[PDB]
């Protein structure tokens, strides 16, 4: 069993990561402004989509870049690339006890397209 130790460097040198995956995801399924709900996909072994965001609805504020999902990259699988989105959630929609006094507080984090569905 031989591991290819030059692949990443040959691909990203002079370009950068995630810039080296640019254009590989194709057309984005969502766009800025769309309201999306976070799917509660099985998180067995690995995931970078926090449990606290599961089932919550937020707003897409930016398509940040293209890249393999961490779920795949973390296991040496970079063949599939998808769009990543920066999503904003109202704190009250995450934490039931959040005070109405701070009704404008939010939380912004990035989620790969696979976890999203039209709200």
């Amino acid at each position: 069993p031989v591991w290819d130790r030059t692949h990443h460097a040959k691909m990203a040198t002079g370009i950068g990561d995630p810039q080296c995956f640019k254009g590989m995801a194709g057309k984005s399924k969502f766009n800025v402004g769309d309201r999306v709900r976070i799917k509660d996909l099985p998180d067995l072994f690995y995931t970078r989509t926090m449990t606290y965001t599961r089932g919550a609805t937020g707003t897409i504020v930016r398509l940040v870049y293209e890249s393999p999902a961490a779920e795949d990259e973390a296991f040496g699988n970079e063949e599939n690339v998808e769009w990543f989105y920066s999503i904003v959630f109202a704190q009250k929609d995450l934490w039931p006890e959040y005070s109405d006094t701070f009704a404008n507080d939010t939380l912004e984090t990035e989620i790969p397209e696979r976890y999203l569905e039209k709200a």
Binding site: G14, G16, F84, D105, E110
Partner: protein
Amino acid sequence: VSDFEILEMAVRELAIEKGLFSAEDHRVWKDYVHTLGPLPAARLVAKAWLDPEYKKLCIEDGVEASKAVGVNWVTSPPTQFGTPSDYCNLRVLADSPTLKHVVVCTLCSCYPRPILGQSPEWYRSPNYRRRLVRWPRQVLAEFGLQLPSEVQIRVADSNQKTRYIVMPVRPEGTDGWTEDQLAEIVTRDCLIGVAVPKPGITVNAKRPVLKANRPV
């Protein structure tokens, strides 16, 4: 010597012996790490305050804006493809009279090392990672920072390849200040979001410092 120092020596010698990376690579990386710090980020904030056009670039393209302060996220690191752990997608979060950002990495310790240096010990603590996203008002208050209830406090959780630095609003009492004077009050804590710049304050708030067995 500790079990950690023994294991560190074992791993490094093994890696070098197997030709995974060279002794030169290791020294080169440590030298690179040694040049990192909060200065470039502080200068970016100062330049943004003094130049509306540049501020817009910061907000829209952090990577491109970073080049103005001497930090090229792709070519500054020894790899020439960005550091393996920080990537190449810096975003600058601009505070406003109605918006104040605070950053964290709940999954680990993700930090914009290339432009800001090494993360604080507390920043990587399970405690900070657990509480900030849910009780930001309380955590910030513990840091001595309080904002109007109407102001939108936005917590940014860097869970993917993006890294953030906070561009706080320029404080009063800095009229006519030069770029150097302004950059001087933009501390590491200000760039993380747990503090706001203040005339006369050029260092992070003093807090306990746990000593290392074998430091520096």
